[PDB]
Design an enzyme around this catalytic site. Structure first.
Site, PDB file in Angstrom:
ATOM      1  N   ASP A 198       2.049  -5.709  -8.575  1.00 12.04           N
ATOM      2  CA  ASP A 198       2.796  -5.332  -9.806  1.00 12.04           C
ATOM      3  C   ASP A 198       4.307  -5.148  -9.507  1.00 12.04           C
ATOM      4  O   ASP A 198       5.138  -5.614 -10.304  1.00 12.04           O
ATOM      5  CB  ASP A 198       2.213  -4.044 -10.404  1.00 12.04           C
ATOM      6  N   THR A 249      -4.576  -4.391  -3.791  1.00 14.63           N
ATOM      7  CA  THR A 249      -5.962  -4.927  -3.879  1.00 14.63           C
ATOM      8  C   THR A 249      -6.369  -5.546  -2.528  1.00 14.63           C
ATOM      9  O   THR A 249      -7.507  -5.389  -2.093  1.00 14.63           O
ATOM     10  CB  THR A 249      -6.026  -5.938  -5.013  1.00 14.63           C
ATOM     11  N   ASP A 285      -0.591   2.767  -5.366  1.00 21.41           N
ATOM     12  CA  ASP A 285      -0.725   1.799  -6.444  1.00 21.41           C
ATOM     13  C   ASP A 285       0.708   1.362  -6.774  1.00 21.41           C
ATOM     14  O   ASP A 285       1.643   2.199  -7.098  1.00 21.41           O
ATOM     15  CB  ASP A 285      -1.400   2.366  -7.701  1.00 21.41           C
ATOM     16  N   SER A 286       0.906   0.068  -6.723  1.00 19.35           N
ATOM     17  CA  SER A 286       2.317  -0.388  -6.796  1.00 19.35           C
ATOM     18  C   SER A 286       2.904  -0.155  -8.194  1.00 19.35           C
ATOM     19  O   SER A 286       4.096  -0.034  -8.295  1.00 19.35           O
ATOM     20  CB  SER A 286       2.536  -1.758  -6.292  1.00 19.35           C
ATOM     21  N   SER A 287       2.114   0.005  -9.239  1.00 20.13           N
ATOM     22  CA  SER A 287       2.705   0.314 -10.562  1.00 20.13           C
ATOM     23  C   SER A 287       3.197   1.760 -10.597  1.00 20.13           C
ATOM     24  O   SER A 287       4.074   2.052 -11.432  1.00 20.13           O
ATOM     25  CB  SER A 287       1.692   0.040 -11.671  1.00 20.13           C
ATOM     26  N   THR A 336      21.264 -12.944 -17.714  1.00 19.84           N
ATOM     27  CA  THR A 336      20.720 -13.845 -18.770  1.00 19.84           C
ATOM     28  C   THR A 336      19.254 -13.510 -19.108  1.00 19.84           C
ATOM     29  O   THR A 336      18.470 -13.151 -18.236  1.00 19.84           O
ATOM     30  CB  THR A 336      20.933 -15.322 -18.402  1.00 19.84           C
ATOM     31  N   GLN A 337      18.889 -13.662 -20.370  1.00 19.21           N
ATOM     32  CA  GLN A 337      17.477 -13.592 -20.777  1.00 19.21           C
ATOM     33  C   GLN A 337      16.713 -14.786 -20.235  1.00 19.21           C
ATOM     34  O   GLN A 337      15.435 -14.740 -20.240  1.00 19.21           O
ATOM     35  CB  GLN A 337      17.304 -13.508 -22.314  1.00 19.21           C
TER      36      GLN A 337
END
Lengths: 319, 312, 308, 303
Positions: free
Chosen positions: A88, A12, A55-57, A253-254
């Site tokens: 992203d 962006t 686009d980074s995604s 770890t979560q």
């Protein structure tokens, strides 16, 4: 006077409101008129606009490689490097470049913005100005990520807020700074078949078995607390069978912050006895990109298991 | 004077120097006169046999706790659940869906350090859960930890270890402590919870969607973006077209998916808004355990059922 | 076309290089100040500039009068000022501009606008922007990306970008009848801190002519010694028409008043020093009686205090 | 190990104060008699002190109670009203020269006996820390934080978060010094403050003046005010410049030409007590001015 190379890969930051569309040379045109970017205390800089913009995604390992190759090609010609990038996957790219740029000895700062640079009070202007200024005047010879007045270690960063100005955090490492030996070696990284999965109560052997089918070479498990999972042969047997055939299974770890701590091997920690290795306090981005870096080389599963646990680039804290 | 039911399900809070001794928690509290202060409610402790290490919790264990609260519902003014920290947020989330038309407080808590040890958070957490269940009733499933009362189905693990164990990233904490009840049978459900990353292959995602999977939680980038490659989108669409429920969550610590021409929506993926992983995983168990069709489940996953999501 | 904001460059580093017309010249070549979402603005440079560490109440009146003169000619006002006493000026203006119905935003900076990475550039740009696009019809103070209620602000860090706070009120945001401009004159006020064993002798010195009022900074929720040596001096002062106002010495919180009340001392509630000092100036300058002043000091006139 | 507890006063050991009611409440709280807790002995001051009525003789009373009991024990805890706890802590840091056992001061919003009282937590941790994790200074314990005593100031007017250390992060043989009341002015400069009002502040018996001036220590460049500060300094008055800011340091110069010296980043409590300490001893104005600027007990930073 310092000279910084700016790779405008996408994001962006360099777009124009319309929503946001890419316009070739837009960033060059805007920066020519912004006098702060031409202050005598600012470095000289050169923009290379990627053609096409990413686009980074949509970023892939091939794009990591293009950016690494661009830095490598320009390495001797500039004092430092700023990568503009979409938000992203910025933390993935920063993490991957940390591994790929071995013996890096100049600063590389990745940044971007919520808002296009030209917009009134946009973070694009502050992020790019500080990235240039810091690479020239306060160099840290690592891959860093600059956002919202903070310089983070790139391989410690994760997305904090889904959007907005405070997009990134380094949950397990202090920011490198607040803006208030050997030749460079780049090996070729390629896409790698990795599963990144989360453990949850009752997760089935059948489900886990399917996560580990070909072509999977490695599994990142996100487990509870300091790295605990169900003590059920149904899950542990599928993890052990995988490692026995050469799959690298890494425990993260979560938790938002903190470390896996599987204790001494002599404690007979159940995942450790199933061949799972600790990922300590790595981010998902650091573990995912580190496995891409190592699986892309000719290393045995045991060699990858050892290097996964070693602090290669400042990505992990072991005790 | 109020009466509170305490289900000691498991966790370090009730253990001694750490191993489980039956009756230990009850015996220890009788020594501790602050629990018998005139301004504290009466309480009864039901010690589970066997105690559950929360890393071993299953949906059958959720069912056991829900059924315990159900059995004891008219006999007390509120409920405290003592639980190990590893999966406490899963259990709080599951009980929020399972206890439909709940109208008494349910507070889940636990501790790093056994109750008995000196300066343990165990003593503070249990004293405050009892006190708040009786005196500051919020008639929902709440989680209490580190002097904060969270909405249960908004909670996730903050620090892997230590006193600051839980956070509600997408909801303000409820409190700084400075129809009739309906319960359906939840069962384990074959759900994949996976993270997207750059270059993630069609073949790996195809593996995640093999039978017996009934639903997939995708953790995607930012406000919910994934690669525009037919390799991924064709596999997600194949799955939704055969009834798999595919839910989009952000990989961000805080914030919401915003799917609005949207590519993932065209592939049949639905927004999980700002849900935690724990809320979305437990909500899919809650809905898949019922007789509901995939379309029903897609609609109900997007609706705010229990305070677990913000959709503005 | 767009709103028009009046910018009073009264003094401060923000406009220096001490060079006439410099700020106007600087801003002309900074394109972000001419953005379509930015208001038009007009700069008036004070001659001479005021060093804020020598600000007097006559300077307060000069600024109030300048706003008066320009009130019906602009949509809002930005006051550029030195940081040392910015919070006193913002506090004084809040009292002097009765029934203000346009935004007044005071700001300045640690670094001159022109320097690379200056906060002067950010501060002026957001004050202008906020005055035009997010008008709050009060005297506000903008610093470190926060708009504070002026009469709620006090100095926070000796220097640095985070130099103000509003310890008893949330920020206004994060980037009746007509206006009556009052007169304020210099007033002999003492501002003193109570400590253990503080003698009646030392407190007498604080209450000597020509003192008309004393601000006491006392302990916690407004406690002083139960010792006749101290309360006698205070009751004696009050009996001869000296207004004695009690503030807490704490960084935040309120006086909750009782012995001091019996010695004639009145509660300053949660007021800042800046608010209480400028409020006494405002009321003493109106030739009101000691009793009229004691009442009005305890009423919320401009949003400076919380009473329960 | 064995800790001495001076119960001087404060909401903590109260019900209104009730003679002996603390000791009898503690007898019935078994966590205080835990094996990992040290032994301790209560001295209940007769009479108790409302910390708002505290005087420097009370500082002496406390310093002497410590000195007397100094060899009998491993460490000391002072139970004290919150109103002036930071003043007491700062005073003892200067008096207790070469201190080599922990002195922790504390108290609470809520009497120790009340359900969910901070009194309980504060006494238990003050005893625990003094034994199990000794720091040999005067420390202040509040809201789960151990502060350096002579760096502490009142944060909120009440509530559980009443103290802060804004200019410092949380944490020979013993020579005990005397201290007496000293005539010290603590005043705040404001715009247009008159030379007349400042002249009156500096009249006898004042030996020293703390100025709370702007920013990094600025005052009006007007002769009216500088003349009176210089006149008082010329006749031996010690004038100390502290910032009005919540945090940060004076950095001095007009005030220095008028004989004013920098208080650096001291708290009001540390400058006011350091003046009490220095004026209570056999020192000239020039010796006091020098020592005010030296870091004696960890109260100030100078680069």
């Amino acid at each position: 006077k310092k000279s910084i190379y700016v790779a405008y890969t996408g994001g962006t930051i360099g777009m124009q409101r319309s929503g946001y569309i890419p316009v070739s040379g837009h960033l060059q045109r805007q920066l020519a008129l912004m006098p702060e970017f031409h202050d005598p205390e600012m470095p000289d800089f050169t923009i290379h606009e990627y053609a096409p913009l990413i686009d980074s995604s949509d970023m892939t390992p091939e794009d990591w490689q293009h950016i690494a190759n661009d830095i490598q090609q320009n390495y001797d010609l500039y004092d430092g490097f700023v990568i503009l990038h979409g938000t992203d996957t910025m933390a993935f790219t920063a993490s991957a470049l940390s591994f790929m740029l071995e013996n890096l000895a100049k600063p590389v700062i990745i940044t971007g913005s919520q808002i296009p640079l030209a917009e009134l009070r946009s973070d694009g202007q502050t992020n790019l100005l500080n990235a240039l200024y810091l690479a020239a005047n306060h160099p840290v010879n690592e891959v860093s990520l600059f956002f919202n007045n903070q310089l983070f270690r790139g391989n410690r960063t994760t997305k904090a807020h889904a959007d907005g100005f405070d997009a990134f955090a380094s949950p397990n490492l202090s920011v490198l700074l607040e803006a208030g030996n050997g030749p460079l070696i780049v090996h070729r990284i390629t896409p790698q078949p990795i599963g990144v999965v989360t453990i949850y109560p009752g997760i089935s052997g059948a489900v886990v078995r399917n996560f580990l089918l070909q072509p999977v070479k490695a599994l990142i498990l996100r487990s509870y607390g300091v790295g605990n999972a169900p003590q059920k042969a149904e899950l542990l047997d599928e993890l052990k069978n995988a490692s026995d055939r050469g799959i690298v299974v890494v425990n993260l770890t979560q938790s938002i912050s903190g470390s896996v701590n599987m204790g001494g091997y002599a404690t007979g920690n159940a995942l450790a006895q199933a061949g799972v290795i600790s990922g300590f306090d790595m981010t998902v981005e650091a573990a995912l990109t580190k496995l891409h870096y190592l699986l892309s080389q000719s290393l045995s599963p045991n060699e990858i298991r050892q290097l996964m646990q070693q602090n290669l680039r400042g990505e992990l804290t072991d005790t």
